[PDB]
């Protein structure tokens, strides 16, 4: 998280939209004002250096500065006025003094820059009004090497100016001499330069806002380069690839390739689907533009594909654009007053880094050399915004968090809260309760905190420019020169220590409890112990090795003064780095961890901060490190809806265990949008600064010091016991290092079941089971214990299913379903999906992966509706489970809805039920129960159940033998059809119903017919008993052996005798 | 918001009620006409919309399955679930708990949704709610008393499990002790571990010779070997040296004798330590301990060539 | 038919997965006949390994135990199908067969953990109502006082209260024609069978039929450690009750009656008897080595048969009558004289005919 400190140096005049100029490399900035017309020259951070009034020789008339331009290398400014004159503002160079290299601090360099700019000179170029024909100088442009100047007036004239850098006795002066006098069609809106070689030649382009883009070279002729059918709006040029882009007022863009003679050939032509359109270079070969709408548009010249970069907030309209190619940041300014900063990791590769709300109509956005954002807003308002990190501090009693340019919220865990507004800005904050101190560059102001009356009593200031300072209970430590001085709150000098220039100047100073860490500008680190009288240094300076240029930006020290966490930045532009550095001074070892693998960039890193008069803190609590980084279930959500309403780039609070064997990743925790920042670590409680309920982040009062328990400290809300807490710390440490046996040993002495559920979760994540049985048995959770025991009994060869069962018992659902996806067990996964009240997921999983447990899903839904007593869906879901022969009749009979079933079966329910075969057979059986024989026969015929029809027909009085014989012979013909098909592919299938017919003949003496129909039916046992009748015994053979029934053959062998 | 006053419905004056029917009672006017007076107890009990009063009226009248239709807050769902378990209605309990994010409880309830004996179901419900003594009593009075054992072993209350196993399962007494002994080996307590390992010996099963009998015999043998190993190791831990050394020498496992040989020096019984060091599988460390602690050169003279 | 396809090509892994999934589906959907069929086939296949693998002895014992568990589950589900149909559906039923089924379920439901979707309330209600209808008044009041201690559906308590209050009248005497008889003890089983359906005097589980669950004149025993199965039948063919002394070792006062003591026979006993007097049951768990069980046949007027795919006992006339339903054995759906190739082409031909319409 970052915030833009705002400097708004007012001027008596009115600001101009496009008249802000920023030097590319030197931290300089200048802008024009009118009535009274002047120019304000300021540094990158926004402090005013100088102001320059009307050009020399003016006869009482103030002249409006109409054009400004910076020299690409020299700290030289050129100003074209409105009366035809031209002036050059030049300050004496700092390096001409040939002083020492003691300018290692920004404040000293700013001071020498200011004292150099005080004696600056504004020189007049002779005869400028003659060359511009008494016309206002509309535009100006230096060459790439800064040797040639081009000026354009309002009288349609273009003049070439030669720069002569002559040496003098004390400095180097500059003379501008006119060379040409070139006529233009219209006053030139923009002058661009083309270099001969990609990285002294004459190659310029002039755009006058009309239908002409006139090139010019050393030939002194204004030959056009490219002319289009419409009036041009703007031109955007890439010097490295010599790529020109012409944009018209009608949302038309053309891409040209500039040759040696400044001639363009069209290769990419495109159309875009009051604020004038703006267009800037987002990346080499990638152009970003906006048409005053809510969307950005990004064009890739290499591929020709145009994408739209969306803004989630409606009503926003882009007003101006700028880009910083060094870090890849676009600064979108809006009419409302919203500044959006985009940082690179074609539209999918960009992201919104941050959002800022200045709150005024942004006329123009400019970017200085160091990355500061100058803003012309409100017509006559200049605001320089400098990105600084959120300066937050915590001592052990209260937290002081910076939330704006100057507002600081100081709040304690006891309920005390107060607001601090510094007279100047805020750059550093140090708290050692009740002492508070703020550093704003030039001076450090230290006050007290009156907790009883919520007052802040100002003690005093020290006029020091040290970037490193720290206030303590006994006094304040601040750097002054090459030395550091530790004093009291009443400016009583207690001690001081001095360092040589070869040892550098301290840049980082961090104190906590009674330990101090000092880091210089050349990676020199010193650790010391503060006392009541002296500062006992522990060892000499130690160099550190980092396996462009690495500069350490921050240093934190644990409460032992033994291990140091280090934040470093890359390059002179201070690009944040994705590495955390841990240094063990006692063992003199250097370890690091990379945040690039997690796609995260850190902001701050914090050690554990023990409370005052609390000496029961072990070294495992001291080695813990915390850092902030940034990249069907209807009665379920309402339980956490209170938290969801308490909610009214992602945050990652990540904690490591700093080990002498290396850095081990302990735990990770996402945050929410109302938890703005982490102010420090107070074991076992995170100290996230948060906004209150239904609050606003920009409000100063709307801030509370929120305290959330660690993810490894579940179930410990008393925060009183010490032995349990330290044993849990050791358990977490041994779980992270993988020493699960020592974790078991540590939790064995803990009577809190929270340690046991932590160990059970560790067993889930480590594949341990017999220890997990003890974990479940210690928490008095017999449900999970018996579930694990049955899982072991049912699956003795699979530990994955047992682990999934344990995780499900431990309220770990997502881990369990992922494990069961890994473990192939889709049926158990479907059962779990049903058991969590998600029948839609069960249906999808059944229809996608395992298409064999969809009937259980339907049946379980039917039972769910039956218990819910929504029978309208219960009946249709019992039908969908293909169990309409046992359950839908049951659900009709039990609810006494028999009349509706009778009406349904008499022939949404009537569309499906009457034609179902199983329902018809059930109703036939039910009517046969009611002795309604004829209705049963009718329904059996409608359901095509030959066995039951033959049984009833043969059981009737008189027996309807003819139709029974017809059906029996039809089934015999079907069986013979099957056997003939089998033989053509190369004793048919017996027909059971024929058995009944034989029984009739068995009661009528028709022995031969009874035997024939028994044999056709497959009644070998009855075949024997009917073969015994007259005399035949061979027919007894070939029957028993067909059944492979040993008893039959045995008995026949006995009976043959 | 009360637990001692019964709710009262004010009957209109001059009424003698004669029949309650569907929550409404017919009261006879002094003229003899019958007028229907509705009880406020049965208010809105035929309404299936999210109304709290209807849910409470159904809840009080044990209309639990009907009240499942009308639930307004998750707390009311929790009340319905705990009451449904309280009324021994597991079929409704599963349906309610499917909407309360307890998949383990639902899965374990689906295993007991079919049981109907009130003692056994009462014991299971008591175990689920966390009333172990009542659950044990119900299981003991039910048709499957062995559940009363399984709750103790799963909770590893080995004293109560062994107390129950003395009359329920005579053959389960050793195994239950053995794990206990192993747990005792974690606590530093070895004196009662000796008794637990000694009682852990299982008599040899006898019967018809087959694969099942052979596998049971092998399991009994392995259990006996583990019990004797633990007993000997704990004997060496406490100081019973001579008794444990015979068992150590009888076996052949190298790791077991290696673990047993370490603790003999602390009790100043260096003769058995000397005997075990040479057969521990290493001679260099044995000779180092000889020359540093034992100082018995006669034994080291034999190990000199190696 | 995909399960039959898997079993035709051996492949035990996918056959196991499919059969277990089908059995679980049938249990969850209360297809108790289907569940019994799937479970008995799972027990049959649990000893079908791959030919390239030689299983260990421990795995063999574990799979034997799982096969016996599946056999017990299949028996319980097949018994419970008709009782559940009578309890929850207005369907035609037999009375004496349902009574004996209820007695068997009561006997074998308390032996071990009851399988899923087999309820004690339904079986107790069925037994009570049938005993009241068949005037088994002493049995009716015994099972009613047992039924007092289970849970019944919300539309059953009033009726069961009325039934159990009315049953307290009438003389306390049960009919001697519909009582189970233990041929081992030669005594009628007047009291309800205990856990495992065992005789009060002998603790031996009675050998019922498996269509109407009526008792059979068979006595179970296991051979000693020095006998086989092949030679016994041939010795009996080549050429008063010897077990009575063993009987005197069972019901004699002072003898240990905590657990059932099986009858034991040696080679001396397996001689000098009738050829058909012995029934040899080889439990079909596949290729797993399991010793055979033996049964003495007390009487000859009752015909008993064994399904070649189940080796359960059935009444021969009732087995033949049930085989006409179009499945075969009611528990196994087994049909003799079936070739794997012909039946495997039958499903293809049926698919062709179904695709035509
Ligand atoms: Zn008996
Ligand atoms: Zn069979």
Coordinates of N, CA and C in Angstrom, one line a residue, chain A residues 54 171 202 709 738 820 878 1012:
Chain A
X54 N 8.7 38.5 -15.6 CA 8.8 39.0 -16.9 C 10.2 39.1 -17.5
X171 N 31.6 30.2 -14.5 CA 30.5 29.3 -14.9 C 30.6 29.2 -16.4
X202 N 19.6 17.1 -38.3 CA 18.4 18.0 -38.4 C 17.3 17.1 -39.0
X709 N -6.8 -12.9 15.5 CA -6.0 -14.0 16.0 C -5.2 -14.7 14.8
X738 N 8.5 -29.6 9.7 CA 8.3 -31.0 9.4 C 8.5 -31.9 10.5
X820 N -10.2 -36.4 -2.6 CA -11.0 -37.5 -3.1 C -11.0 -37.4 -4.7
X878 N -39.0 -39.7 -7.1 CA -39.0 -41.1 -6.9 C -39.2 -41.8 -8.3
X1012 N -44.6 -82.6 -21.6 CA -44.0 -81.8 -22.6 C -43.9 -80.4 -22.2

